[PDB]
Design an enzyme around this catalytic site. Structure first.
Site, PDB file in Angstrom:
ATOM      1  N   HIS A  53      -7.189   5.130  -3.622  1.00 19.46           N
ATOM      2  CA  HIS A  53      -6.216   6.010  -2.993  1.00 19.46           C
ATOM      3  C   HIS A  53      -6.646   7.469  -2.996  1.00 19.46           C
ATOM      4  O   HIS A  53      -5.983   8.293  -2.358  1.00 19.46           O
ATOM      5  CB  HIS A  53      -4.862   5.855  -3.681  1.00 19.46           C
ATOM      6  CG  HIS A  53      -4.034   4.740  -3.124  1.00 19.46           C
ATOM      7  ND1 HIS A  53      -2.658   4.794  -3.059  1.00 19.46           N
ATOM      8  CD2 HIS A  53      -4.388   3.551  -2.585  1.00 19.46           C
ATOM      9  CE1 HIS A  53      -2.201   3.680  -2.518  1.00 19.46           C
ATOM     10  NE2 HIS A  53      -3.230   2.909  -2.219  1.00 19.46           N
ATOM     11  N   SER A  84      -8.230   4.047   2.542  1.00 17.94           N
ATOM     12  CA  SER A  84      -8.927   2.808   2.850  1.00 17.94           C
ATOM     13  C   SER A  84      -9.971   3.012   3.940  1.00 17.94           C
ATOM     14  O   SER A  84      -9.831   3.865   4.820  1.00 17.94           O
ATOM     15  CB  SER A  84      -7.938   1.730   3.295  1.00 17.94           C
ATOM     16  OG  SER A  84      -7.092   1.336   2.231  1.00 17.94           O
ATOM     17  N   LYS A 122       2.726  -6.735   7.713  1.00 15.76           N
ATOM     18  CA  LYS A 122       1.424  -7.354   7.933  1.00 15.76           C
ATOM     19  C   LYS A 122       0.977  -8.138   6.706  1.00 15.76           C
ATOM     20  O   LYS A 122       0.465  -9.258   6.827  1.00 15.76           O
ATOM     21  CB  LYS A 122       0.391  -6.287   8.290  1.00 15.76           C
ATOM     22  CG  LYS A 122      -0.726  -6.771   9.189  1.00 15.76           C
ATOM     23  CD  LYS A 122      -1.299  -5.619   9.990  1.00 15.76           C
ATOM     24  CE  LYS A 122      -2.675  -5.953  10.533  1.00 15.76           C
ATOM     25  NZ  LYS A 122      -2.879  -7.418  10.644  1.00 15.76           N
ATOM     26  N   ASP A 123       1.160  -7.564   5.516  1.00 13.39           N
ATOM     27  CA  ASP A 123       0.820  -8.275   4.291  1.00 13.39           C
ATOM     28  C   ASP A 123       1.766  -9.440   4.040  1.00 13.39           C
ATOM     29  O   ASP A 123       1.365 -10.446   3.445  1.00 13.39           O
ATOM     30  CB  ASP A 123       0.836  -7.314   3.102  1.00 13.39           C
ATOM     31  CG  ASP A 123      -0.372  -6.397   3.077  1.00 13.39           C
ATOM     32  OD1 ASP A 123      -0.478  -5.577   2.141  1.00 13.39           O
ATOM     33  OD2 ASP A 123      -1.215  -6.494   3.993  1.00 13.39           O
ATOM     34  N   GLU A 182     -15.906 -24.912 -13.337  1.00 12.75           N
ATOM     35  CA  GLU A 182     -15.044 -24.833 -12.171  1.00 12.75           C
ATOM     36  C   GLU A 182     -15.857 -24.385 -10.961  1.00 12.75           C
ATOM     37  O   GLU A 182     -16.897 -23.734 -11.086  1.00 12.75           O
ATOM     38  CB  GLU A 182     -13.885 -23.872 -12.426  1.00 12.75           C
ATOM     39  CG  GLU A 182     -12.779 -24.449 -13.293  1.00 12.75           C
ATOM     40  CD  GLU A 182     -12.119 -25.657 -12.659  1.00 12.75           C
ATOM     41  OE1 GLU A 182     -12.127 -26.737 -13.283  1.00 12.75           O
ATOM     42  OE2 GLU A 182     -11.590 -25.526 -11.535  1.00 12.75           O
TER      43      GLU A 182
HETATM   44  C1  HEM Z   1      -7.754  -8.728  -9.423  1.00 14.68           C
HETATM   45  C2  HEM Z   1      -8.700  -8.355  -8.555  1.00 14.68           C
HETATM   46  C3  HEM Z   1      -8.509  -7.282  -7.454  1.00 14.68           C
HETATM   47  C4  HEM Z   1      -7.385  -6.682  -7.022  1.00 14.68           C
HETATM   48  C5  HEM Z   1      -5.925  -6.895  -7.483  1.00 14.68           C
HETATM   49  C6  HEM Z   1      -7.754  -5.748  -5.981  1.00 14.68           C
HETATM   50  C7  HEM Z   1      -6.888  -4.939  -5.282  1.00 14.68           C
HETATM   51  C8  HEM Z   1      -7.222  -4.153  -4.205  1.00 14.68           C
HETATM   52  C9  HEM Z   1      -6.298  -3.567  -3.262  1.00 14.68           C
HETATM   53  C10 HEM Z   1      -4.762  -3.719  -3.300  1.00 14.68           C
HETATM   54  C11 HEM Z   1      -7.003  -2.878  -2.364  1.00 14.68           C
HETATM   55  C12 HEM Z   1      -6.420  -2.091  -1.172  1.00 14.68           C
HETATM   56  C13 HEM Z   1      -6.020  -3.060  -0.063  1.00 14.68           C
HETATM   57  C14 HEM Z   1      -7.201  -3.870   0.399  1.00 14.68           C
HETATM   58  O1  HEM Z   1      -8.242  -3.269   0.770  1.00 14.68           O
HETATM   59  O2  HEM Z   1      -7.095  -5.121   0.414  1.00 14.68           O
HETATM   60  C15 HEM Z   1      -8.407  -2.998  -2.705  1.00 14.68           C
HETATM   61  C16 HEM Z   1      -9.469  -2.438  -2.032  1.00 14.68           C
HETATM   62  C17 HEM Z   1     -10.799  -2.601  -2.359  1.00 14.68           C
HETATM   63  N1  HEM Z   1     -11.301  -3.445  -3.332  1.00 14.68           N
HETATM   64 FE1  HEM Z   1     -10.203  -4.733  -4.470  1.00 14.68          FE
HETATM   65  N2  HEM Z   1      -9.121  -5.803  -5.812  1.00 14.68           N
HETATM   66  C18 HEM Z   1      -9.619  -6.731  -6.701  1.00 14.68           C
HETATM   67  C19 HEM Z   1     -10.946  -7.076  -6.840  1.00 14.68           C
HETATM   68  C20 HEM Z   1     -12.014  -6.418  -6.268  1.00 14.68           C
HETATM   69  C21 HEM Z   1     -13.415  -6.697  -6.502  1.00 14.68           C
HETATM   70  C22 HEM Z   1     -13.907  -7.813  -7.451  1.00 14.68           C
HETATM   71  C23 HEM Z   1     -14.140  -5.843  -5.756  1.00 14.68           C
HETATM   72  C24 HEM Z   1     -15.677  -5.678  -5.616  1.00 14.68           C
HETATM   73  C25 HEM Z   1     -16.587  -6.302  -6.370  1.00 14.68           C
HETATM   74  C26 HEM Z   1     -13.210  -4.997  -5.039  1.00 14.68           C
HETATM   75  C27 HEM Z   1     -13.548  -3.984  -4.171  1.00 14.68           C
HETATM   76  C28 HEM Z   1     -12.676  -3.311  -3.344  1.00 14.68           C
HETATM   77  C29 HEM Z   1     -13.039  -2.342  -2.333  1.00 14.68           C
HETATM   78  C30 HEM Z   1     -14.475  -1.884  -2.000  1.00 14.68           C
HETATM   79  C31 HEM Z   1     -11.917  -1.916  -1.750  1.00 14.68           C
HETATM   80  C32 HEM Z   1     -11.815  -0.887  -0.608  1.00 14.68           C
HETATM   81  C33 HEM Z   1     -12.094  -1.631   0.691  1.00 14.68           C
HETATM   82  C34 HEM Z   1     -11.683  -0.814   1.884  1.00 14.68           C
HETATM   83  O3  HEM Z   1     -10.976   0.209   1.703  1.00 14.68           O
HETATM   84  O4  HEM Z   1     -12.074  -1.189   3.017  1.00 14.68           O
HETATM   85  N3  HEM Z   1     -11.926  -5.376  -5.371  1.00 14.68           N
HETATM   86  N4  HEM Z   1      -8.500  -3.788  -3.834  1.00 14.68           N
HETATM   87  C1  LIG Z   2      -2.025   2.164   1.380  1.00 11.43           C
HETATM   88  O1  LIG Z   2      -2.396   1.789   0.053  1.00 11.43           O
HETATM   89  C2  LIG Z   2      -1.936   0.586  -0.309  1.00 11.43           C
HETATM   90  C3  LIG Z   2      -2.683  -0.521  -0.208  1.00 11.43           C
HETATM   91  O2  LIG Z   2      -3.949  -0.492   0.243  1.00 11.43           O
HETATM   92  C4  LIG Z   2      -4.128  -0.605   1.655  1.00 11.43           C
HETATM   93  C5  LIG Z   2      -2.127  -1.838  -0.614  1.00 11.43           C
HETATM   94  O3  LIG Z   2      -2.825  -2.822  -0.519  1.00 11.43           O
HETATM   95  C6  LIG Z   2      -0.731  -1.914  -1.130  1.00 11.43           C
HETATM   96  C7  LIG Z   2      -0.236  -3.283  -1.506  1.00 11.43           C
HETATM   97  C8  LIG Z   2      -0.973  -3.842  -2.688  1.00 11.43           C
HETATM   98  C9  LIG Z   2      -0.784  -3.542  -3.970  1.00 11.43           C
HETATM   99  C10 LIG Z   2       0.227  -2.552  -4.467  1.00 11.43           C
HETATM  100  C11 LIG Z   2      -1.620  -4.221  -5.019  1.00 11.43           C
HETATM  101  C12 LIG Z   2      -0.872  -4.411  -6.344  1.00 11.43           C
HETATM  102  C13 LIG Z   2      -1.314  -3.387  -7.337  1.00 11.43           C
HETATM  103  C14 LIG Z   2      -2.249  -3.531  -8.271  1.00 11.43           C
HETATM  104  C15 LIG Z   2      -2.649  -2.463  -9.239  1.00 11.43           C
HETATM  105  C16 LIG Z   2      -2.978  -4.844  -8.378  1.00 11.43           C
HETATM  106  C17 LIG Z   2      -2.486  -5.741  -9.526  1.00 11.43           C
HETATM  107  C18 LIG Z   2      -1.032  -5.532  -9.806  1.00 11.43           C
HETATM  108  C19 LIG Z   2      -0.244  -6.264 -10.591  1.00 11.43           C
HETATM  109  C20 LIG Z   2      -0.709  -7.471 -11.352  1.00 11.43           C
HETATM  110  C21 LIG Z   2       1.206  -5.899 -10.755  1.00 11.43           C
HETATM  111  C22 LIG Z   2       1.659  -5.934 -12.223  1.00 11.43           C
HETATM  112  C23 LIG Z   2       2.173  -4.603 -12.678  1.00 11.43           C
HETATM  113  C24 LIG Z   2       3.381  -4.321 -13.172  1.00 11.43           C
HETATM  114  C25 LIG Z   2       4.464  -5.343 -13.361  1.00 11.43           C
HETATM  115  C26 LIG Z   2       3.722  -2.910 -13.582  1.00 11.43           C
HETATM  116  C27 LIG Z   2       5.131  -2.740 -14.177  1.00 11.43           C
HETATM  117  C28 LIG Z   2       6.085  -2.144 -13.187  1.00 11.43           C
HETATM  118  C29 LIG Z   2       7.270  -2.615 -12.785  1.00 11.43           C
HETATM  119  C30 LIG Z   2       7.824  -3.900 -13.329  1.00 11.43           C
HETATM  120  C31 LIG Z   2       8.160  -1.943 -11.782  1.00 11.43           C
HETATM  121  C32 LIG Z   2       0.019  -0.799  -1.216  1.00 11.43           C
HETATM  122  C33 LIG Z   2       1.430  -0.734  -1.706  1.00 11.43           C
HETATM  123  C34 LIG Z   2      -0.542   0.515  -0.811  1.00 11.43           C
HETATM  124  O4  LIG Z   2       0.125   1.523  -0.892  1.00 11.43           O
END
Ligand code: HEM
Ligand SMILES: COC1=C(OC)C(=O)C(C/C=C(\C)CC/C=C(/C)CC/C=C(\C)CC/C=C(\C)CCC=C(C)C)=C(C)C1=O
Ligand SMILES: COC1=C(OC)C(=O)C(C/C=C(\C)CC/C=C(/C)CC/C=C(\C)CC/C=C(\C)CC/C=C(\C)CC/C=C(\C)CCC=C(C)C)=C(C)C1=O
Ligand code: HEM
Ligand code: HEM
Ligand code: HEM
Ligand code: HEM
Ligand SMILES: COC1=C(OC)C(=O)C(C/C=C(\C)CC/C=C(/C)CC/C=C(\C)CC/C=C(\C)CCC=C(C)C)=C(C)C1=O
Ligand SMILES: COC1=C(OC)C(=O)C(C/C=C(\C)CC/C=C(\C)CC/C=C(\C)CC/C=C(/C)CCC=C(C)C)=C(C)C1=O
Ligand code: FES
Lengths: 68, 28, 116, 109, 387, 33, 57, 153, 387, 51, 28
Positions: E207, E211, E233-234, E277
């Protein structure tokens, strides 16, 4: 902040059809998908399929050779 | 706008309770 | 060099494919150079005249609008596109030359990237 | 200079305290005393038919016993020592030419 | 604007941080459905935690009771079978979503500047996911749980000096036993919380610059708020994911695993087919390709070194594969190679799979070796391709 | 004269929207709310 | 007709109750319909279709 | 009470079966690949070994069993069980019935699980149609927009 | 200024958030040592988590093995007696520090505006600490643990209609059994992480306006950076706390406890004396002063209701007790009353302790009933005391 | 007594060692705090107000 | 030429700390 010069016209979401656009110009959509990505699909499928068939061919020849 | 809303939201809360907890049989 | 389209035919196909992809969006190759990628592009962009930067920003908004809409430019508009007309490479090269000259004489950089 | 000398005295304790607490957690994950008290025993065995392999139990280490036929002994003595990844002879690994007693745990993992 | 009165409640200090980070954060308008897998990964983490906390109310981490307590969940707990299958299949779904998430970044060069720290934090997250899922798979204490733990905890033995010392300390004894299972259960409860915190830092790092977009260009001219446009969309992806997850939970609950984990652990006999796995198979194939224990562990580490070193390689200033035909071809060859490696990992160690795995492992490492020189050559493209 | 300047100076009641993704309802139709 | 209809699109409290009621009745109807098709497709295989049900010796 | 155990421990089971341990059958159909089919084929697949194959004393040949040498004898013979419903107790009938019983024992929740799957996959598909409509309705104002800029190339 | 170059690394985006919230946060220069117990409570939470994670590597949540696993921790694992005593006595230190932290807030009226949300988040934290510590005390499965869990889960039976069904749902059956102990273990691993999040929000709410000071006045004219002035002042408290903690761990490890928990749980015979941990005794006393089932539970809820309604009472505009002689005197009577209630809870239910407990309970609730009256009367102090 | 607390001898040796060591750290902690604060506690503040 | 001395000085500290955390006197 980026300085921008533009004119944008927008229509209300309740004044337009929402889903009929999914199946509009379908032949064009299929043609665009195939023509732009056939090299990409070839580069992904051929090594996987070719390697898979070679292993099965290798196993079949090895199995037959050990028979009596 | 205040009493009617309070009655409406209380009705929704009661409906939600009957929907989440099903007290069918407890209505005796 | 092998990257010369005139000498190497493989480079001719590479240049043609890039031009075709850029022309579909109305984008120049120099519009893909983003100022957040490094501070030299940002410095080069800041030195360019306003009319060039305004035109770059409008081509980028048109392309992002087309990409969002799952659309391409109309063929009439695609005919007038100039995907490889440069506006940044010369300024970028000059900025790099000035940066290297500062480094050679032991001066501090005029700009550094924020540690993220 | 005096202030730095005095502050270093308390820094001695802080480093020692951090080292103690970190080490105490690490050693707590090592083998417990009840585990270490079960690391040395003895088991007797008998005989098996030729050409077979019986697996016995010691302390989580299966033991492979194979009665090798005379043909097996010739096949195991007609190999180059140099090509072996671990240079070893057949005689130095066996007492009876018929009974091979080895622990059945792969040295890889 | 002088803020004397209270405007919209979302701008008050009680929810200003949530408004600016979740609701009004500006997002590129041309983001495709491939950008919805980050939110899906976060939802998969929530599913794993919620089901795991309720499964731990019935699971006993003792070698004499671990297998039977899992069967007690499946048979006796009201709704137990569902919690177990949502957690077992949930780990697979988590890895599917994350694998697609990683390959989206590779295709669009999302790792490049200015988002190097986002990629590096993701790699650490991937390590946490691997460790978390593996030690969890040992908890049922089946045949593959026991023999899976016997191998990985022996990887430390590749170290010459202290390799055996670390193996014994990791075991808590001279073999895999109740000490190993009890310590694996505690770590399996703690690591998911560390993974939650790492995800928050991961999202926060992204952030800072926003993105990346499918065109890979500057996106400040056409940015829209996340809510409601990318919320709805999500939401489409969330519902489509729920149908896919439901297919496994209710109709194919055991195809993604192996039947050998339904046999109680036996330290004496060993299964003829010991595999991890499916989501650890590509890493497993690279390990088996090298005919040396020390070399195999170094190869696994080199995989994560290559992933970590990717954002910092001097490269060309073009990001999207939509404008990099050569890098686009390399990406699809890498995807086929990763699928080939996973299939080879399920194969026994014998011809011709030994040679195929070695070639597959070589091609995987070539992608990270060829990428930097493509950028150096590609930097001269604008000079060469004039108007 | 630039297109944006011409558009600003000349209001146009016969506006045409992009219809690749969505086709509009006839003008003068009740809302689909 | 119009009385409930005008209350549903005008008050969110009424609309929320309409959503709750639809979830209650909609899920029950699907559950009933799914079970009827399940019973039709499995004639003679039920527990109460066992002929010797009740005579172990 | 649980079903009674035939032996006091594993060692007693092995001693009474020539050193082989008859595995617990609670999850056998889930603990083998193609479990329902494999158990039926193994039970009804005792036949003479192929030419050139000799079986050591105490074992029996079964091609479906890995290695081909099984320590279990052919136990499903005709009329081995008397059925209370009068169905003929043939080898295949008893083999089919016991695998059906074993299948239920490994997966006693299948009928409840399958009923939940059909209902919720159908309901989620309906929500997917609404989710697509909701997304497209919100985005329609952006997708149908007309953007006017001054740039040409 | 134009941030063209990189100045101090603390101001870089990698550490700017940590710098503004920890190193350079403006703090009133006249804060006393009574403002160091917030960091002490944070350090106690970290100690409990670290020792608890390593103790969970050796503990078995089974009624047939829970008691012996704790004894195995004490006798077999190297340094396990230290981890267990650090954890058992760490819970007492956590409550000692938090009790002193709450009373500082009462004396200096730190709950008053604009810090109402800070106090309310603290009350939620206090509830989380109580539930966390209670279910942890059940884990050793001693005589104290069994009979302790029997009545707390039975408190839900005070509800007339659904009270019995909540009790059986909390038990997981019809009596406190292995189902109760297994679910208490899972919740005891999760609630400490929820406590970490609640404390972070607690800290964030306080940083909106800054900390209160002993004079209770506006302090924006004499603020200094937290580092190093209040870091080195907190470091003195941490070392002093360590000496206090070390005395309990190494020389009196069982004084703050009851020997009855060293007897394995016997569902047949209750002990003649049945009391909670010392930090739960004041709540025990208010419960036993009401000669009614429902009244006792209602009074317990009224304690937390009164603590929640404290910041919202219409109060005078003077905070510190150092300028409010009447409020200052009432505070010392309330502290003496809370000490008396804890002592009463340790006493058997008989004369004269029934009358004393009833009077002490009334005095405790009178504090929260008189404080709003003091504010309304005290509002006219500036108009009556004229120069 | 030994069977109930077999670690007592090690526990007591640890307590004497570390309570003594932490007491030295407390003395150093006070010097460090009073050294950093001395510039604030000995400062002379000149203001304009009287009453 | 002080970065090299800085590296050598910190290398001694790293070695000194390593022998301090892990005390392998019974192994040398
Ligand atoms: C529990 C695992 C993960 C979570 C919850 C997570 C979450 C997110 C979220 C919410 C975003 C913003 C929305 C999106 O682009 O889909 C993001 C972006 C991104 N993540 Fe992940 N991510 C995970 C694992 C990873 C891993 C393993 C990698 C790389 C090895 C990675 C690399 C990136 C990158 C490069 C972006 C930016 C992509 C862009 O802006 O086009 N993430 N991640
Ligand atoms: C423009 O940018 C943004 C994105 O990118 C394009 C997104 O994709 C999303 C949507 C995705 C999100 C928020 C991913 C979730 C956040 C994280 C850090 C990944 C793992 C989160 C977990 C496991 C949630 C557990 C946390 C808790 C319960 C905290 C306690 C709080 C409360 C109970 C209220 C949002 C809102 C966003 O704005
Ligand atoms: C045939 O054979 C095989 C299998 O069988 C079937 C497999 O299934 C797999 C798949 C497995 C993997 C891909 C996982 C391998 C990768 C990793 C990273 C290993 C995962 C890591 C572990 C298991 C180690 C667990 C971690 C620990 C014990 C951490 C120890 C440290 C702790 C708890 C903290 C240390 C303490 C301190 C520093 C003290 C101070 C600390 C404070 C907090 C204050 C393979 C390859 C295989 O060939
Ligand atoms: C704090 C949250 C979590 C808790 C408390 C938890 C707890 C448990 C428990 C008690 C089990 C044993 C019951 C069973 O075998 O089904 C288990 C198994 C498992 N967990 Fe988790 N878990 C958590 C999060 C996760 C996460 C995030 C993952 C994925 C990375 C994961 C992957 C697994 C796997 C693969 C199994 C084995 C499933 C099987 O084959 O039976 N868990 N977990
Ligand atoms: C209808 C009755 C029975 C059924 C359905 C049955 C089922 C099975 C199954 C599924 C296996 C394992 C197959 C495998 O390992 O892949 C097995 C193995 C075995 N059974 Fe049974 N069993 C039956 C009766 C018996 C009886 C009556 C005996 C002894 C008198 C017996 C002794 C054994 C032994 C010794 C093995 C181990 C075989 C080996 O390891 O090679 N079984 N049985
Ligand atoms: C996630 C962090 C935590 C874990 C994993 C954890 C785990 C455990 C375990 C396994 C036990 C049983 C072993 C024993 O009896 O000594 C235990 C006991 C206990 N825990 Fe925790 N705990 C944690 C945090 C806390 C916190 C924050 C508190 C205080 C609010 C607490 C209070 C207790 C108490 C009072 C006992 C009983 C001590 C006794 O044996 O008398 N724990 N904990
Ligand atoms: C997990 C336990 C807790 C932690 C870690 C914690 C932490 C802190 C910290 C670090 C501060 C700021 C520095 C200070 O004044 O000491 C603070 C302030 C405060 N806390 Fe807590 N706290 C906890 C529990 C509570 C409880 C139970 C209450 C009472 C309901 C409470 C009420 C307050 C108040 C009123 C302040 C503002 C004090 C002032 O600035 O004068 N806290 N807390
Ligand atoms: C002699 O008698 C007594 C004891 O004995 C020795 C005691 O110790 C105590 C001490 C107890 C006190 C002070 C109160 C404890 C307070 C609470 C709220 C505990 C209740 C909580 C429980 C049982 C666990 C919480 C359960 C949850 C959250 C359910 C989980 C569900 C989901 C996640 C969906 C008292 C009063 C007592 O009189
Ligand atoms: C001027 O401001 C400040 C204060 O006055 C308001 C303080 O009193 C303190 C000192 C006290 C603090 C910070 C108490 C806070 C304690 C909490 C939230 C509970 C325990 C803390 C944990 C577990 C750390 C969690 C935080 C993060 C980022 C996760 C990663 C951490 C670890 C893995 C250990 C500090 C540093 C401060 O600046
Ligand atoms: S453990 Fe035997 S080859 Fe790896």
């Amino acid at each position: 902040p980026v300085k921008l010069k533009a004119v944008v016209y927008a229509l209300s979401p309740f004044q337009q059809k929402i889903m009929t656009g999914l199946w509009k110009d379908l032949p064009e959509k299929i043609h665009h998908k195939v023509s732009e990505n056939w090299i990409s699909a070839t580069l992904l499928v051929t090594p996987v399929v070719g390697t898979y068939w070679y292993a099965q061919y290798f196993k079949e020849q090895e199995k037959l050779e050990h028979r009596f | 706008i205040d009493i009617q809303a309070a009655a409406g939201w209380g009705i929704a809360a009661a409906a939600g309770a009957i929907w989440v907890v099903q007290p069918f049989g407890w209505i005796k | 060099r092998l990257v010369d389209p005139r000498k190497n035919f493989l480079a001719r196909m590479h240049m043609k494919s890039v031009s075709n992809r850029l022309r579909r969006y109305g984008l120049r190759y120099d519009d893909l150079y983003d100022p957040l990628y490094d501070l030299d592009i940002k410095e080069a962009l800041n030195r360019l005249p306003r009319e060039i930067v305004d035109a770059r920003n409008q081509r980028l908004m048109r392309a992002m609008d087309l990409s969002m809409k799952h659309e391409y430019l109309p063929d009439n508009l695609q005919a007038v596109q100039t995907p490889f007309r440069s506006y940044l490479q010369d300024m970028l090269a000059l900025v790099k030359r000035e940066r290297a000259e500062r480094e050679a004489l032991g001066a501090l950089p005029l700009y550094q990237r924020t540690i993220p | 200079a005096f202030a730095y000398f005095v502050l270093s005295g308390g820094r001695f304790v802080y480093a020692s305290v951090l080292r103690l607490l970190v080490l105490k957690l690490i050693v707590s994950m090592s083998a417990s005393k009840d585990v270490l008290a079960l690391a040395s025993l003895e088991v007797d065995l008998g005989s098996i038919e030729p050409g077979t392999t019986v697996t016995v139990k010691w302390r989580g280490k299966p033991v492979f016993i194979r009665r090798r036929t005379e043909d097996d002994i010739k096949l195991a003595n007609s190999v180059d020592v140099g090509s072996l990844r671990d240079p070893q002879e057949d005689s130095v690994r066996v007492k009876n030419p018929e009974w091979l007693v080895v622990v059945g745990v792969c040295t890889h993992l | 604007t002088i803020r004397n009165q209270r405007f919209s409640l979302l701008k008050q200090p009680i929810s200003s941080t949530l408004n600016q980070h979740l609701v009004d954060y500006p997002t590129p308008s041309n983001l495709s459905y491939w950008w919805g897998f980050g939110s899906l990964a976060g939802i998969c983490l929530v599913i794993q935690i919620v089901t795991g906390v309720f499964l731990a109310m019935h699971y006993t981490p003792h070698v004499d009771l671990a297998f039977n307590s899992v069967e007690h969940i499946m048979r006796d707990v009201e709704g137990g079978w569902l919690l177990r299958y949502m957690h077992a299949n949930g780990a697979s779904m988590f890895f599917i979503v994350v694998y697609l998430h990683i390959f989206r970044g590779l295709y669009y060069a999302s790792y490049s500047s200015p988002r190097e720290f986002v990629w590096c934090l993701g790699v650490v997250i991937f390590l946490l996911m691997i460790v978390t899922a593996f030690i969890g798979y040992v908890l049922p204490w089946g045949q593959m749980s026991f023999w899976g733990a016997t191998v990985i905890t022996s990887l430390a033995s590749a170290i010459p000096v202290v390799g055996d010392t670390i193996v014994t300390w990791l075991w808590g004894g001279f073999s895999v036993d109740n000490a190993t299972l009890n310590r694996f259960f505690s770590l399996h409860y703690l690591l998911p919380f560390i993974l939650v915190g790492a995800s928050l830092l991961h999202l926060a790092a992204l952030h800072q610059y926003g993105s990346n977009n499918p065109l890979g260009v500057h996106s400040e001219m056409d940015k829209i708020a996340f809510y409601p446009y990318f919320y709805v969309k999500d939401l489409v992806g969330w519902v489509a994911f729920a149908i896919f997850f439901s297919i496994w939970i209710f109709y194919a609950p055991n195809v993604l695993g192996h039947p050998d984990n339904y046999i109680p652990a036996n330290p004496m006999s060993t299964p003829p087919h010991i595999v991890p796995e499916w989501y650890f198979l590509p890493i497993y194939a690279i390990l088996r390709s090298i005919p040396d224990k020390a070399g195999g562990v170094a190869a696994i580490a080199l995989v994560f070194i290559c992933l970590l070193a990717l954002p910092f390689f001097k490269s060309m200033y073009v990001r999207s594969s939509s404008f990099r035909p050569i890098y686009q071809g390399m990406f699809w060859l890498l995807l086929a190679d990763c699928l080939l490696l996973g299939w080879i990992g399920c194969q026994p160690v014998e011809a011709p799979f030994v040679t195929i795995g070695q070639i597959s492992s070589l091609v995987f490492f070539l992608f990270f070796a060829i990428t930097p020189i493509l950028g150096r050559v590609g930097r001269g493209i604008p000079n060469s391709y004039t108007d | 004269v630039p297109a944006t300047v011409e558009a600003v100076k000349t209001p146009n009641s016969k506006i045409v929207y992009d219809d690749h993704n969505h086709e509009r309802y006839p003008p003068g139709d009740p809302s689909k709310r | 007709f119009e009385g409930f209809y005008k209350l549903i699109m005008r008050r969110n409290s009424v609309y929320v109750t309409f959503i709750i009621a639809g979830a209650f009745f909609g899920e029950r109807a699907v559950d009933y319909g799914v079970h009827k098709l399940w019973e039709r497709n499995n004639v003679g295989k039920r527990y109460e279709d066992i002929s010797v049900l009740g005579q172990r010796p | 009470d649980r079903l009674p155990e035939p032996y006091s421990n594993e060692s007693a089971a092995r001693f009474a079966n020539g050193g082989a341990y008859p595995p617990d059958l609670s999850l056998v159909t889930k603990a083998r690949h193609n479990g329902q089919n494999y158990v039926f084929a193994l039970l009804t697949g005792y036949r003479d070994p192929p030419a050139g194959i000799s079986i050591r004393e105490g074992l029996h040949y079964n091609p479906y069993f890995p290695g081909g040498a099984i320590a279990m004898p052919k136990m499903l013979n005709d009329e081995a069980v008397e059925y209370e419903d009068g169905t003929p107790a043939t080898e295949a009938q008893m083999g089919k019935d016991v695998v059906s019983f074993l299948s239920w024992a490994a997966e006693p929740e299948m009928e409840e699980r399958k009923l939940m799957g059909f209902k919720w996959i159908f309901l989620l598909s309906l929500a997917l149609l609404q989710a697509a409509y909701y997304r497209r309705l919100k985005w329609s104002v952006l997708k149908s927009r007309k953007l006017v800029l001054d740039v040409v190339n």
